[PDB]
């Protein structure tokens, strides 16, 4: 049986092939003695100086990230590595010396009989059920837009913005003190994570919405503390998410993600924009916000010709849209030669990969 790791800023997400969901999901944090792995070395900051070793989907540091691979075979999937192949996936853009990295890795030091290396945006278009579209992918720690043209992502166009659900927690914990309440601690920053992930909406209209917030208690919601007390939340539940349209919210001088949506489809062929506009694939946890694909739908459609036809797909299990394309892909055993094997690693090297 094949597996499966998606390797993200924030998390990893890692199981079998052909299960529907990753059997593993933990923080990417590596903890350092001034090892420990995910919510392990979290528990213990002070004593150990934290890494996150993928930053903005890329690798940037390989003995950190050779310890987060060893905690997903031996501690979370428990799992013989020398027994699977082993489908990885790589940010949009990763460089061509990263994937020999990988690749020399996964060889020698997990000794797997085989491995394969996806594009996560690509991955996240198949699972859905097509090859050619454009992917909004969204994480913890970066937003790529992602055009793709029969399984290939044009690099000449994709766009990118230094943020994501990390920074919305954050900015929820901020705004959340303007209602007096105090959310501070790394405990009380897991609560913020909870009440975002439970209670945040993307509204259609950013400045109605704030009206129909201030003109009424229609949109309030209470959410139970863990000490039992109770607090009620308003115009916060969107205006948390809104910061993806409106990067300024949090200090960016970037463009909204309708914006380098629509940037990164001009940036593409004439002859296939149609193609793109029919088929925006939102993908990623941060993308889970309820109305988000209303929202892209609107936001776009004004930036677009008046006859184009848009479309926006959001799967409903978009938050794991990349592990499950490649479990997918890793599934089909017919194309088991698409597979590099050891030996054919043995006579090449690590530029086999490419
Ligand atoms: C199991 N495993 C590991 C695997 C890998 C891969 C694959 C692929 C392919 C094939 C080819 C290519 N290519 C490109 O792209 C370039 C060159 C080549 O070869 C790509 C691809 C993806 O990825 O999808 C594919 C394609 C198509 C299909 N169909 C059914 C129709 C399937 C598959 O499968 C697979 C599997
Ligand atoms: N229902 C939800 N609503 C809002 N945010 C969510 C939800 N579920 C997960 N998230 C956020 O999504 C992020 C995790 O998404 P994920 O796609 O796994 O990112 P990643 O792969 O770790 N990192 P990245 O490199 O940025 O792609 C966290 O910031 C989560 O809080
Ligand atoms: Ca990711
Ligand atoms: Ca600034
Ligand atoms: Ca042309
Ligand atoms: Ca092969």
Known sequence: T??????????????????????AVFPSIVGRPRSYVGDEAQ????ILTLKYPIEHGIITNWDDMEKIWHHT????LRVAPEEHPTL???????????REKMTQIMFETFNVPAMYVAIQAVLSLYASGRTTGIVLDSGDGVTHNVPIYEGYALPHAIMRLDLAGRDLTDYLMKILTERGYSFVTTAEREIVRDIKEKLCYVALDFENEMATAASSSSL?????????????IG??????????FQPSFIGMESAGIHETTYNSIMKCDIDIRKDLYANNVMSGGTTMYPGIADRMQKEITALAPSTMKIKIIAPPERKYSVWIGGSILASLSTFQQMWITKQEYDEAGPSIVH
């Open 73 to 76: 075979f031996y501690n979370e």
């Open 88 to 98: 990885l996936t790589e940010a949009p853009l990763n460089p061509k010396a990263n």
């Open 235 to 244: 115009n916060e539940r969107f205006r948390c998410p809104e910061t993806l």
């Open 43 to 46: 528990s213990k900051r002070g």
């Open 2 to 23: 094949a597996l499966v790791c998606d390797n993200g800023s924030g998390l990893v997400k890692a199981g079998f092939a052909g299960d529907d969901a990753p059997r």
């Open 220 to 232: 309030e919601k209470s959410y139970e503390l863990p000490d039992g007390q109770v607090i009620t």
